[PDB]
């Protein structure tokens, strides 16, 4: 089953965190990251489409995240705002969808 995992689970301020993904399906159409506990257009950090190997940032984007090709995501120079939940939306090649949620905590 799709899964995410902050590391560190707790995150020093001005430093950085990585959200790992687990059970990423074999065959993908694309995938997306979202500030929140849910998939929401206006809260998208970034979308990666396989067909173009490209990453187009959404509205939520702080310009300090980096997505990688195994669906993992990295936020550098974390601020207090970055704390919270984060949600991964994944689209399979047959277009069946999948989400998983995760979370990290920043401290000053």
């Amino acid at each position: 089953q799709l899964t995410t995992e902050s590391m560190p689970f707790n995150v020093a301020e001005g430093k950085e965190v990585l959200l790992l993904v687990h059970n990423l399906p074999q065959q993908l159409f694309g995938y997306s990251w979202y500030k929140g506990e849910r998939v929401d257009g206006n809260r998208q950090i970034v979308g990666y489409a396989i067909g173009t190997q490209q990453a187009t940032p959404g509205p939520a984007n702080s310009g300090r995240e980096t997505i990688y090709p195994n669906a993992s995501l990295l936020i550098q120079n974390v601020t207090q705002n970055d704390t919270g939940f984060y949600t991964l939306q994944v689209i399979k090649s047959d277009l069946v969808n999948e989400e998983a949620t995760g979370q990290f905590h920043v401290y000053p």
Binding site: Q27, L28, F29, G30, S32, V39, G41, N42, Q44, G47, Y48, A49, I50, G51, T52, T56, G58, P59, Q89, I91, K92, S93, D94, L95, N97
Partner: protein, 318 residues
């Protein structure tokens, strides 16, 4: 002297390419370009991926285009979750782009049931409905559209350009057609030579239509440089144009053969009786027309020396 029979030949020729249908290379070539385009779309359509955002990402909204050959359905629906990712080259069509395709598609279908008229004929009109829902909202429009080659080719051109310029990606798998993987495939990779071939046909059929046009409005009805230099250049012009036509039509069969090479070799010419069960084969009655063209070409080739004489006489005046 050798004129009056040569003109009769040039004129009779036009009457026959332009007024007739059964034995007309021009007609059949045109009809083959339209059937194929349709044929293409039926084979491919269930798997093209439409729905990218153009302004901003969103999974909520979803258009359904009716009388499309989808998988279980007689409609295709342009994805909602796909909406989360930008439309563009090599990814996903926009909903707009699909709508503009679907329009062009519905027109050509409607006009084939009614049936393409002769090329001299520009009058014929055709009624066409275009139903499209959202999620809720629903639009049905029945408008009158010109049923002539000139126009239907423009619709075909609309269709193939959508595919070639945007190269949408294609659904994975999970009885399918055999070009379908379990992974996504860039439709310009998989179907490249079909797109190029059908494109080349549309584009050639257009010139056929042009040339016949000018030909039709230009029927034809002595000394040294005594102003019968005109109406030789005339005679020249028509022959040089009838030659162009016959050539182009031949080439439409030749352009079609390229497919008979590539991945839709078999599928584009086959069917099952638009319905739920028409996805993945061309279901446009292509063979019948192909063999009809091939024969048109053959039968008319017997004019190819009469035509070349027209030219060689013409030039010797000059």
């Amino acid at each position: 002297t050798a004129i009056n029979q040569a003109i009769g030949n040039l004129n009779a020729n036009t009457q026959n390419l332009i007024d007739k249908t059964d034995n007309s290379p021009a007609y059949q070539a045109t009809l083959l370009a339209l059937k194929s385009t349709v044929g293409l779309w039926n084979s491919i359509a269930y798997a093209v991926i439409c729905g990218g955002y153009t302004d901003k990402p969103n999974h909520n909204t979803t258009e359904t285009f009716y009388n499309q050959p989808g998988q279980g359905s007689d409609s295709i629906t342009c994805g909602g979750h796909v909406g989360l990712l930008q439309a563009g080259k090599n990814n996903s069509l926009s909903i707009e782009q699909f709508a503009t395709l679907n329009k062009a598609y519905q027109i050509i279908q409607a006009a084939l049931k009614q049936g393409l008229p002769a090329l001299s004929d520009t009058k014929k009109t055709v009624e066409v409905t275009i139903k499209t829902a959202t999620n809720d909202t629903t639009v049905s429009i029945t408008d009158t559209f010109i049923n002539d080659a000139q126009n239907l080719l423009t619709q075909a051109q609309t269709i193939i350009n959508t595919l070639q310029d945007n190269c949408p990606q294609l659904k994975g798998k999970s009885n399918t057609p055999s070009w379908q993987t379990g992974a996504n495939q860039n439709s310009c990779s998989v179907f490249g030579t079909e797109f190029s071939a059908i494109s080349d046909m549309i584009s050639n059929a257009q010139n056929i239509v042009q040339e016949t046009q000018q030909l039709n409005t230009t029927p034809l009805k002595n000394l040294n440089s005594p102003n019968s230099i005109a109406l030789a250049q005339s005679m020249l012009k028509n022959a040089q144009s009838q030659a162009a036509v016959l050539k182009l039509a031949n080439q439409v069969g030749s352009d079609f053969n390229r497919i008979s090479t590539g991945v839709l070799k078999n599928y584009i010419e086959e069917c099952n009786a638009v319905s739920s069960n028409t996805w993945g084969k061309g279901c446009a009655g292509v063979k019948q027309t192909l063999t009809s063209l091939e024969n048109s070409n053959a039968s008319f080739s017997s004019q190819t020396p009469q035509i070349n004489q027209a030219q060689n006489l013409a030039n010797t005046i000059v």
